[PDB]
Structures are given as structure tokens and as C-alpha cells.
């Protein structure tokens, strides 16, 4: 447990120092692709649960 | 249940079109793998924009 | 969270507001990451952001 949490704290600190590894253009590619998928799938967003909800 | 999934998977293979025919030199490939670190590499900032597309 | 004397209880200067807004636009919704960077409590900088 102690070792694992150490290397953990290491990886967090290295993720803050070294910045996001996903770069940028890649991330845009992901977001865009997902957008196209949900588009062709007619998926309507899930709204917030209303105060009156019978279920 | 998972084992029933195994059954759907086998008969799913066996029901494919001309699946076992090696006459012309056809070649089948089964591939099993893991995403290795997946949970650990999810980026929160990205995950937020990804969820904004859903809910 | 609160009683610790090292915690800073006072108004936010202009620099702290610039820094808080910029960072909050940088890493949305992450308060426990931002709070140490500006030197304030997460709940406090939340309240100040809203």
C-alpha cells in the first residue's frame, strides 16, 4: 500500500509538471469523433432529474 | 450471464458467412487484449467535455 | 478546512481573482487542484468564484 501510494503521488506530480499527455490536436480528434457518432445516433441528451419525477 | 455470452460468441462465429472455408486461402484471426492502463490514464479535463456531450 | 491558522481568511486581491478565474477556465470543476495553487481553501475559492 505504501509503495503504491508513493509511486501514485509521483505520477500525479509528474502529470501536473509535465502537463497533459494527450497533447491537443489528438484531444480535438477524440471530441470531434464522439460528436459525429452521437450525431448519427440521434442520441438526445440526458436532462437533469426534475423535482417531480414519478420514478 | 457471462457464460451465455461465451455461447453467443461461439455460435456467433459459426454463423458467419463462409467462415471456415480455406479454399481460396482465407485467413481468420482471433485477437484478445486489454487496454492496459485505461482508468488511470483518463484525463479529467477531457472527461468533462466528453460528459457535456451526454448529460 | 477552516480552523487551521495557515488558512487565509480575508478579501481576495486583484491578482488572486485573475489567477483564480484563469485557472478555473484552465481546469474546469477541479477545486482541489486549484486551491493549493492560489493558496486558499477549496470551499473558499468556490464560494468566491460563484
Amino acid at each position: 500500500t505504501r509503495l503504491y501510494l508513493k509511486a501514485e503521488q509521483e505520477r500525479q506530480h509528474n502529470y501536473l509538471k509535465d502537463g497533459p499527455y494527450i497533447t491537443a490536436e489528438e484531444a480535438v480528434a477524440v471530441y470531434t469523433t464522439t460528436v459525429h457518432w452521437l450525431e448519427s445516433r440521434r442520441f438526445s441528451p440526458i436532462p437533469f432529474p426534475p423535482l417531480s419525477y414519478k420514478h | 450471464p457471462p457464460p451465455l455470452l461465451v455461447y453467443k460468441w461461439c455460435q456467433g462465429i459459426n454463423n458467419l458467412q463462409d467462415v471456415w472455408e480455406t479454399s481460396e486461402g482465407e485467413c481468420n484471426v482471433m485477437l484478445e487484449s486489454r487496454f492496459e492502463k485505461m482508468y488511470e490514464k483518463i484525463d479529467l479535463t477531457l472527461l468533462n467535455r466528453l460528459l457535456r456531450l451526454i448529460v | 478546512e477552516w480552523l487551521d491558522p495557515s488558512i487565509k481568511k480575508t478579501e481576495w486581491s486583484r491578482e488572486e481573482e485573475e489567477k483564480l478565474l484563469h485557472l478555473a477556465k484552465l481546469m474546469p470543476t477541479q477545486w482541489r487542484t486549484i486551491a493549493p495553487i492560489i493558496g486558499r481553501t477549496a470551499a473558499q475559492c468556490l464560494e468566491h468564484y460563484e
Binding site: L16, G19, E25, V28 | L46, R49 | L26, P28, I37
Partner: peptide, 27 residues
């Protein structure tokens, strides 16, 4: 004076990269 030793009174007994900006503004 140099070899004054701080008493070891016992308690038992951060920076950020700017790439986050480029990413976030990109998204």
C-alpha cells in the same frame, strides 16, 4: 555555533505547466 543541532522535536513521537492552458482553450 555551526554544530548547533536543531532539536529533532518529533511530529510523530507546487507548480503547474502552461500546456494545460493550450489544451483547455483548444477544447
Amino acid at each position: 555555533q555551526e554544530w548547533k543541532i536543531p532539536p529533532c522535536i518529533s511530529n510523530w513521537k507546487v507548480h503547474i505547466n502552461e500546456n494545460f492552458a493550450k489544451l483547455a482553450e483548444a477544447l
